[PDB]
């Protein structure tokens with residue numbers, strides 16, 4: 551049967567509802583509308599398998615295909631962060647940028663306590679997902695990463711990019727999993743991060759799919775195809791491109807702004823639906839980052855404040 555109209559209708563709708571549920575936090579139809587359409591698309595794909603596609607909404611539920619866990623080199627090494635433990639540490643970081651390159655805007659973000667990942671896109675399609683590993687070599691967990699709804703299977707522009715994201719289990723989901731685990735005499739998960747690790751380290755993606763995992767995208771390997779002149783702009787650019795990012799990001803004009811942000815999120819962290827273990831602070835302008843460059847270990851243009 552021709553069926554192209556109904557398949558495309560279902561892709562339009564199921565992509566629409568999945569984006570509303572997992573990226574926005576505002577669904578537009580009940581669970582039942584999404585559950586009915588998805589069962590229909592699965593049934594079409596069962597009876598008419600020529601309609602199945604690499605980026606179908608049905609990918610989300612996991613398949614028979616197993617994550618290899620093969621050791622795979624990142625396109626570009628994933629940068630590692632230097633740490634700050636107080637305000638003095640932060641004024642030293644601010645002092646040393648401003649002595650070199652002058653006065654800067656900062657980009658402040660919540661530091662997602664997750665599993666760092668590389669998400670490689672070819673012609674706008676999700677094709678490879680690796681753990682961070684040693685920063686240079688990771689493990690291929692692609693088949694499990696694909697079941698995370700906050701990861702687009704297809705970008706709005708056909709880009710050859712490798713994005714970096716923090717993959718995580720929402721706390722509420724972590725707590726109900728431990729409820730289920732306690733009720734079924736299974737040893738409990740230690741924290742959201744270990745639960746998200748265990749579910750990603752699955753050989754079975756169907757099992758990953760039933761875990762309520764998400765992602766926040768923080769960086770990209772190459773800014774050639776991006777019009778962004780700053781980190782703040784690159785995340786807005788990532789939004790328009792189809793990616794899930796943290797909305798709590800803030801551009802501040804100075805280190806008083808930086809400490810003001812830390813003060814807010816010390817006293818607001820409790821209420822978040824996800825674990826954070828710090829605040830990442832970056833020089834916002836991209837040219838200025840290039841101007842600050844790197845030591846042997848880390849960016850000089852970025853620091854992670856760690857919670858006490």
Ligand SMILES: OCCNc1cc(-c2n[nH]c3cnccc23)nc(C(F)(F)F)c1
Pocket residue numbers: 628629630631659660661662663666716768769830832849852
């Ligand atoms: O544990 C290794 C984390 N590596 C990095 C994470 C983030 C990062 N930026 N924003 C985030 C939010 N949550 C967690 C991590 C990051 N940014 C960098 C960079 F600045 F060097 F590029 C490296």
